[PDB]
Nucleic acid binder design. Sequence first.
RNA 1: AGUUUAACUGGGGCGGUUGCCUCCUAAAAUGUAACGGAGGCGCCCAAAGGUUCCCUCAACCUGGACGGCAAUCAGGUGUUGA
Length: 182
Amino acid sequence: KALPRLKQRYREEIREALQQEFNYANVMQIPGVVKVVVNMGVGDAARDAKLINGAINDLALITGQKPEVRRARKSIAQFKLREGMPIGARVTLRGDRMWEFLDRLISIALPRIRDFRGLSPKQFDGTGNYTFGLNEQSMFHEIDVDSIDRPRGMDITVVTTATNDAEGRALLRALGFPFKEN
RNA sequence: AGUUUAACUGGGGCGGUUGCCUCCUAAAAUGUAACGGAGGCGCCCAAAGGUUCCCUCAACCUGGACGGCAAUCAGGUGUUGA
Ligand SMILES: [Mg+2]
Ligand SMILES: [Mg+2]
Ligand SMILES: [Mg+2]
Ligand SMILES: [Mg+2]
Ligand SMILES: [Mg+2]
Ligand SMILES: [Mg+2]
Ligand SMILES: [Mg+2]
Ligand SMILES: [Mg+2]
Ligand SMILES: [Mg+2]
Ligand SMILES: [Mg+2]
């Protein structure tokens, strides 16, 4: 009875546009976004685990889902890290949660991006993938700026079903992220 | 005053060893020496035990920023090279 505007968009207009613009043999060659990944590894828990709790608090308030933290999958003396210390916080999505969060992000954080300049095609990998790292956490609405103690990191990435980068870029710009003009 | 004050030893003495475990020497059953070649043990564990269940890496291209050659990542060749 309730469902996200991007879900509808995908069903009716994005799918039709991509089909027309690439002449797929079948309807569903249309790649579809698979997983929005939201993790973080500070690397500072090796000296103090207090900041990890705050980062997870930010992740929970941003998502409402309870992020996990992983240990030192290997151990490195140079990084002063031993296996078993928690360094990486994760929080994942799927489906309606994926696209509600994506709509909120596109509507709020992107126009809210200080000195926003658009994102380039070239950080793809040719297989329809898209991932990079957030300047600052404070960009988000539900988070409180008066309570942020130290500027820490967040990431909410997107992925595709695209076989190559061509379809990935086509559908992604159809969704309408701010690609550069070069 | 009665006694003790090791053996191995390529002469003795000084060095080193003295039991146990792994490999090679070992001639494709076992076994098989040398002061031959090389390494460890005199523990750890209420779970690192039992069982049931889930699942499997690392190699890999990219980076909304720190964050770098490497921190967490997901897309999608991935057969122990972890
Ligand atoms: Mg894809
Ligand atoms: Mg006598
Ligand atoms: Mg003798
Ligand atoms: Mg002699
Ligand atoms: Mg001698
Ligand atoms: Mg034999
Ligand atoms: Mg003999
Ligand atoms: Mg020894
Ligand atoms: Mg058990
Ligand atoms: Mg992935």
